[PDB]
């Protein structure tokens, strides 16, 4: 009898969905945890919340791709207090990296607290409009992850990724329509930003929306090609 079972996506399971907690008996954000036991192995998982992490919506609304999986070297823009991070941080696991880039400092202390846990987690406490000034900090990676809010932000994105996406990394960027532009259209905002991708050499490859967890909220997942 298997209660949590391995999900299409590696590193993430249904039990709803979970992720397999790299520091055993410790929450970060409240969440529930389940522990099993059988004989002398013993594995926990930490529940998922899809109400506070976009990443979660998208994964129970279907998307094909998420490019974080264990060993995966990873860029998260906008890392906030650590919440999605912490299960990107699950999914990688030992052997993968989460550069977690946050302007706020009172954010940025729960991110050094969640990281003082967790090896694989990087605090990168700075303005992720000049990525020039931490270049120094930031190993290449395999995918970038950003919330997306003002109509600079994916053009800030995309400067992130020519300075540390590889070439043929991807990148899943989720975007606020209403915070793009409230007096456009969500179809006209989402459009308008995948065009900016596709400026960038950002090339979409599946976009959803996160109903019923978010309203006018997409994310788009692609890959990028940037010319030689
Ligand atoms: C909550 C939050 C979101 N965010 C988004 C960006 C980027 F412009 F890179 F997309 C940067 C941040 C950040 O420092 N905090």
């Known amino acids: 009898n298997v209660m949590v079972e391995p999900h299409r996506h590696e590193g993430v399971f249904i039990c ?19 522990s ?6 013993k594995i926990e998982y930490r529940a998922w919340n899809p109400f506070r ?3 979660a919506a998208a994964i129970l609304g279907g998307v094909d791709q998420i490019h974080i999986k264990p060993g995966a070297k990873v860029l998260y823009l906008g890392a906030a207090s650590g919440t999605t ?21 009172r954010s940025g202390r729960d991110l050094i607290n969640l990281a003082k846990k967790r090896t694989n987690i990087i605090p990168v406490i700075e303005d992720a409009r000049h990525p020039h000034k931490y270049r120094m900090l930031i190993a290449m990676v395999d ?32 975007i606020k329509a209403n915070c793009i532009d409230s007096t456009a259209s969500a179809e006209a905002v989402f459009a ?11 090339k979409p490859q599946e976009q959803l929306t996160l109903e019923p967890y978010e309203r006018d909220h997409a994310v788009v997942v692609g890959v ?5």
């Open 143 to 174: 995918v970038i992850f950003a919330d997306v809010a003002q109509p600079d932000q994916t053009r800030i994105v995309a400067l992130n990724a020519h300075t540390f996406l590889r070439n043929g990394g991807h990148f899943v960027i989720s």
């Open 192 to 202: 308008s930003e995948v065009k900016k991708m596709q400026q960038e050499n950002m």
């Open 85 to 105: 991070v912490s299960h990107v941080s699950d999914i990688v696991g030992p052997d993968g990296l989460v550069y977690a880039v946050e302007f706020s400092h």
């Open 16 to 34: 709803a969905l979970v992720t397999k907690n790299l520091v055993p008996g410790e929450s970060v954000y409240g969440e529930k945890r389940v």
């Open 224 to 228: 990028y090609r940037p010319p030689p």
């Open 53 to 55: 992490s976009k990443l």
């Open 36 to 41: 099993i036991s059988e004989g002398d192995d």
